Design a protein around this ligand. Structure first.
Ligand code: HEM
Length: 148
């Protein structure tokens, strides 16, 4: 598949510095959907502003977790069936913390923003399409965690 190669090559750029890039992803996410901020409750306390989240070690560890799951999807781009049961359970976990299924479209747009800004002119419409399809497949598997 030509799409598989566009994903592996663009990911190579991002995965060199995962926290710096995941920081961009989450900064964009809170700019688009501020109501996601209170869902990160560590020690039963809420962040007041988005910049508060960037000083939290637990929050930064969640950024690392996110980037590792994407890395697993990229590594298995030819065979995403192998990640399916793990992703369903990851969906169930997020449902339990209070994430709505609709918020996964915002996450997808923030991922595309982070790729666009990192790759610049190397972010071609073919690259955008490849990532949209991969992200779509990941979301389909996770959405099984919301009962169906
Ligand atoms: C709407 C955006 C999201 C919110 C509000 C959110 C919130 C959380 C919270 C509160 C936890 C538990 C505390 C913690 O482990 O830090 C968590 C766990 C986790 N999240 Fe997220 N998350 C979001 C998106 C994602 C995405 C897109 C991925 C990966 C693709 C991801 C991967 C994980 C992983 C791997 C865990 C640990 C699950 C476990 O094994 O218990 N999360 N999420």
């Amino acid at each position: 598949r030509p799409e598989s190669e566009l994903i592996r090559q663009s990911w190579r750029v991002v995965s060199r510095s995962p926290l710096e890039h995941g920081t961009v992803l989450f900064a964009r996410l809170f700019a688009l959907e501020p109501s996601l901020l209170p869902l990160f409750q560590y020690n039963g306390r809420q962040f007041s502003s988005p910049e508060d989240s960037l000083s939290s070690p637990e929050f930064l560890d969640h950024i690392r977790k996110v980037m590792l799951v994407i890395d697993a999807a990229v590594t298995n781009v030819e065979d995403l069936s192998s990640l399916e049961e793990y992703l369903t359970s990851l969906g169930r976990k997020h449902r339990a913390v209070g994430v709505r299924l609709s918020s996964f479209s915002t996450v997808g747009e923030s991922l595309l923003y982070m790729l666009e800004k990192s790759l610049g002119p190397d972010f071609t419409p073919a690259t955008r399409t490849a990532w949209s399809r991969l992200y779509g497949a990941v979301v389909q598997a996770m959405s099984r965690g919301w009962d169906g």
